[PDB]
Symmetry: C2
Subunit: 434 residues, 2 copies
């Protein structure tokens, strides 16, 4: 009952992270002895996804190299979607079931011949591979510890059920990286419905910064003609790049936050995590169970380090003139004890008086503590036309910034009288106080 | 069908040649992965024998260490005769069948699960272990390459057949070290009937030199009370010591010779090996098949290096006085181009005239070539009583020594007139000639 495999399982090593050297044929125990397999250590399983070409994508070598870097003396298994994924995309959607059955048979054979503990295997799933793993494991008798996927496919999986798509019950623990969701429901490539016990929605899933418009023209540019095809795939690989970055930087994991909605997170009222919230993201994620879908949010840098901070702010606006204004740009800057940002902007419409506001700010440099603050208010009338005549202004009292990683209700504090924030004027300084 | 084993198979490593660390349980494939087992390389199987104590004899560690020294990256398996061999000796003779069945089941299971090539395993057998292996393998479907044993047991195996004792058909190739045969037929511990394709009878099997009388008294000495028990076991371990010495000294193996009988070899008429005779002894033995039992003979040093030479000699005695003498001692010495022996004696009765004689000589030092010779003739009348009056004497012409390892019919050559060998007289010099 091991003749309908048609999907070769490879086993690379740190010295060779490019070419598949081994072939762990199910049933034929000879391969296990042929290629060293530490039955005591943990063993990952990478499941790549659809590829227009006839070869592995460019990210697998880096992923596997980083995996060995993080956890040496641990086996790695790769699959051979090729010969089946090259077919029409819906055909791959159908063949997900066959590959899942194949992987389940593989794991069952391993647990029968070698009784390898199932609690030491990850089904790293990308693109269609995540759904493939999800449909897999469920057939396994002893379940699976981790089924962490990457950018689960949306088409032909929304409006579905657990047997036909990744489900929380498919494994003991699960987490997904919703790195792309822009578009109408049920048609965006990236599924938006939460699937795992904990889900991550970096940047809100609308898009990612480390890219540009991309395709200049159908013929002049390269839609899938290499070149700018990768640029077109702005976010679909950002999941794997984020995962590998987190794996490499184990010392300082990025702390994704738990909230209620993307707009709520943007406002910044849902950052404090006294309970089991705001868990880590990546390999060092904390294993936790939830009574329901638990959305999360965070931000990131462009490409290389990621790992940004979060310093949401509140303002107790209280002035004299009561003419409400809307759609105004606020610019602030902060200085600390390690480094300092200079000209970070942000937006806050519907400004009023005798009212308190709040917003979310992010920086991409470590600052540690924070001493003083800048609160410049920008205008489109730089020249001396609007430098004398009375322009709208407000008064600033206290400021209640809250550090993200460490809960610090530091109370910033306007000076005795030297604030009077005004349009087209120098910022207002603040200091630690109280 | 793997619950009646009751004989644990161990697997030592070069770093641990004393204590069994692993347990390759048949059927349970987990042990193979637990303990590294290079399925490509050769794998020996040591089968020790009866022991009055409840632990492995003192030679197993040295044997296994030397085995690793000779062939690194090669697995070694040890058996656990203990718990069954401690019983009465005949009970062990009966249990040989059970252990053989167990080993056959082990090997068959290996050839089924891992299809390990049977042509890369040795069943190193000692004492009862040799017969155990011989009864083993025969049940194996794919036969065995080498079944080299050591000092096969004699009792309850003479007057037997192949199924109940080691046989040439039990494996592809076989060789035994008949290191002890003194005693009546069918009662000497060491079987004297040839068994394998090629058999080795060092020193003729009567005894070995590296020992003494041993047991001084039943109570005062230590029959089996340790101490002189090893001395009593003068030859039974000489087999394994010879094997380990040959294994360690791979560069210069000892060349055992093929002959017709021990007396014929002692005479020295059966050393030349133009055909496939005089094969090596030990690991570097040349694999050969014979139409029948092929006895062999050789000599050895005391304990450490072994590896002695063979320089049989012929004498063309031709003198005037025709009074035959008998039971006389001849002393000779030789000098070469590397080293030289000084006072090696030998015996030759039934000395006559106009007749040619021959004998076998051995030396324990490398000599390479040989230049001159000594032919002193000893007497028990050293003093000047027999120094003047005419004592019996002969004349010497040519000498036809023959080098063993290299066939060299070097013709020694008496001087013009200066020979006249006489009793109680200075030797007669000889040189290379012709």
């Amino acid at each position: 009952d091991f003749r309908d495999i048609e999907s070769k399982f490879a086993l690379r090593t740190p010295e060779d992270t490019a070419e598949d050297t081994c072939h762990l044929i199910p049933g034929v125990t000879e391969s296990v002895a042929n290629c060293h397999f530490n039955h005591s250590s943990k063993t990952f399983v990478v499941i790549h996804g659809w590829t227009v070409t006839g070869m592995y994508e460019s990210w697998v070598p880096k992923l596997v190299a980083a995996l060995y870097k993080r956890e040496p003396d641990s086996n790695v298994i790769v699959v051979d979607w090729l010969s089946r994924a090259q077919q029409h995309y819906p055909v791959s959607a159908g063949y997900t079931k066959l590959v899942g059955q194949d992987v389940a048979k593989f794991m069952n054979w391993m647990a029968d011949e070698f009784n390898y503990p199932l609690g030491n295997v990850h089904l790293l799933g990308y693109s269609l591979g995540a759904h493939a793993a999800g449909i897999a494991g469920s057939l396994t008798n002893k379940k699976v510890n981790r089924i962490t996927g990457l950018d689960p496919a949306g088409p032909n999986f929304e409006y579905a059920e657990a047997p036909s798509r990744l489900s929380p019950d498919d494994a003991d623990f699960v987490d997904v990286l919703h790195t792309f969701t822009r578009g109408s429901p049920g048609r965006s490539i990236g599924i938006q419905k939460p699937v795992g016990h904990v889900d991550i929605y970096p940047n809100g899933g609308t898009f990612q910064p480390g890219c540009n418009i991309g395709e200049a023209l159908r013929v002049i540019a390269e839609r899938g003609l290499g070149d700018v095809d990768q640029l077109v795939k702005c976010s679909h690989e950002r999941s794997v790049h984020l995962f590998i970055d987190s794996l490499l930087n184990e010392e300082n994991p990025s702390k994704a936050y738990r909230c209620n909605s993307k707009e709520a997170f943007e406002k910044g009222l849902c950052l404090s995590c006294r309970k089991n919230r705001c868990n880590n993201m990546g390999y060092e994620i904390n294993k936790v169970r939830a009574k329901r879908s638990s959305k999360m949010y965070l931000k990131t840098r462009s490409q290389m380090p990621y790992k940004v901070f979060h310093y949401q702010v509140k303002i107790h606006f209280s002035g004299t003139e009561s003419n409400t204004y809307t759609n105004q740009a606020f610019e602030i800057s902060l200085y600390g004890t390690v480094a300092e940002s200079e000209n970070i902007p942000f937006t806050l419409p519907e400004v009023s008086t005798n009212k308190t506001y709040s917003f979310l700010l992010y920086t991409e440099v470590d600052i540690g503590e924070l001493l003083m603050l800048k609160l410049k208010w920008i205008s489109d009338s730089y020249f001396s036309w609007s430098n004398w005549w009375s322009s709208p202004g407000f008064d600033i009292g206290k400021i209640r910034v809250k550090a993200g990683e460490t809960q610090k209700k530091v109370i910033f504090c306007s000076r005795e009288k030297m604030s009077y924030l005004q349009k087209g004027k120098s910022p207002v300084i603040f200091v630690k106080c109280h």
